[PDB]
Design a protein around this ligand. Structure first.
Ligand SMILES: NS(=O)(=O)c1cc(C(=O)O)c(Cl)cc1Cl
Ligand SMILES: [Zn+2]
Length: 258
C-alpha cells in the first residue's frame, strides 16, 4: 500500500508515512501575485542547456522522467536566487484529467493544465542523494503549461510515450534539447520549499516562471494515455498526478520582475 494519487493513497494520506508532509516549507504553494515582493537584488537566471545530454525516458509509476547525464557540468542552472551551480538531472511533468487542473503551483488560485519541473542539484554536495539532505540542495525550474497551440519542442517527448505506457518501462531518449521547452521570458517567482512527491524533503529552491508555455490538446491527451499500473495489470490512467497547494507558513515569495 504505497503512496500515489488515488483516494486511498493520495496526498491527504502521505503524512502517515512521511510526516514532513505537514512541515514548515512544503511545496507546492499558491503564488499570490499581489503579495509576492519584487526583489531588485535577485539576478537573471542563467539557464545553460546547450551541452545537455539526455539519456533515457522512464515511466516510474507516478510520472515519466527524462533523464540526463549529470556526471559533468553539461546542463546547469545558476544565478537568480541561487548560490553556485546546479546540474540538471531530470525533468518530468504533472498534469490533470481535464484542462482545468494539473499544475501543482497555482497563480492567484488559477490551475494550469500541467506543470514541467526541471530538477537540478547543487554541485557542492557531490551527488543528488547527498543534495536532497540539504536545505539548498536542489533547484527546480517550474514551467506552467496551458492548452492552445502545440509546443514543437515537446513533440519528441509525446511521440515516445506509447513505448513507456506502463510503470517500469523505459526507452532510449538521446539528443533531446530541453531548450525547446522554455518560454520566451525568464521572469520568475522564487521561494524555499520541498519535493512535491514523497519523501517530500525540504531541500528545494523553487523558481517558477511567470510565462506559461502552450501545448496542444493532442499533446496533453497523449500524456493522459499513460498508465500508473504495470504491464498486464488493469488500466489506471496516469492523470491527476499533482499535489495541491500547501500552507505558505513563514515564507515570502519573491518576484524577479516588477
Ligand atoms: N516534483 S518535484 O518536487 O520537482 C521532484 C520530483 C521528483 C520525482 O521524480 O518524483 C524528484 Cl526525484 C525530485 C523532485 Cl525536486
Ligand atoms: Zn514535479
Amino acid at each position: 500500500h504505497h503512496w500515489g494519487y488515488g483516494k486511498h493513497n493520495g496526498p491527504e494520506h502521505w503524512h502517515k508515512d512521511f510526516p514532513i508532509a505537514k512541515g514548515e516549507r512544503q511545496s507546492p504553494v499558491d503564488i499570490d501575485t499581489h503579495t509576492a515582493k519584487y526583489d531588485p537584488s535577485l539576478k537573471p537566471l542563467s539557464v545553460s542547456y546547450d551541452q545537455a545530454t539526455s539519456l533515457r525516458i522512464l515511466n516510474n509509476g507516478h510520472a515519466f522522467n527524462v533523464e540526463f547525464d549529470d556526471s559533468q557540468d553539461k546542463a546547469v542552472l545558476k544565478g537568480g536566487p541561487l548560490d553556485g551551480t546546479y546540474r540538471l538531472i531530470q525533468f518530468h511533468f504533472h498534469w490533470g484529467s481535464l484542462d482545468g487542473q494539473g499544475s501543482e503551483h497555482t497563480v492567484d488560485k488559477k490551475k494550469y493544465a500541467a506543470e514541467l519541473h526541471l530538477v537540478h542539484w547543487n554541485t557542492k554536495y557531490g551527488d543528488f542523494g547527498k543534495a536532497v539532505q540539504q536545505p539548498d540542495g536542489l533547484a527546480v525550474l517550474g514551467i506552467f503549461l496551458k492548452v492552445g497551440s502545440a509546443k514543437p519542442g515537446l513533440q519528441k517527448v509525446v511521440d515516445v510515450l506509447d513505448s513507456i505506457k506502463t510503470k517500469g518501462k523505459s526507452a532510449d531518449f538521446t539528443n533531446f534539447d530541453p531548450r525547446g521547452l522554455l518560454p520566451e521570458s525568464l521572469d520568475y517567482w522564487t521561494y524555499p520549499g520541498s519535493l512535491t512527491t514523497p519523501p517530500l524533503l525540504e531541500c528545494v529552491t523553487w523558481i517558477v516562471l511567470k510565462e506559461p508555455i502552450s501545448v496542444s490538446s493532442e499533446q496533453v491527451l497523449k500524456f493522459r494515455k499513460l498508465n500508473f499500473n504495470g504491464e498486464g495489470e488493469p488500466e489506471e490512467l496516469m492523470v491527476d498526478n499533482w499535489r495541491p497547494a500547501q500552507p505558505l507558513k513563514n515564507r515570502q515569495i519573491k518576484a524577479s520582475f516588477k
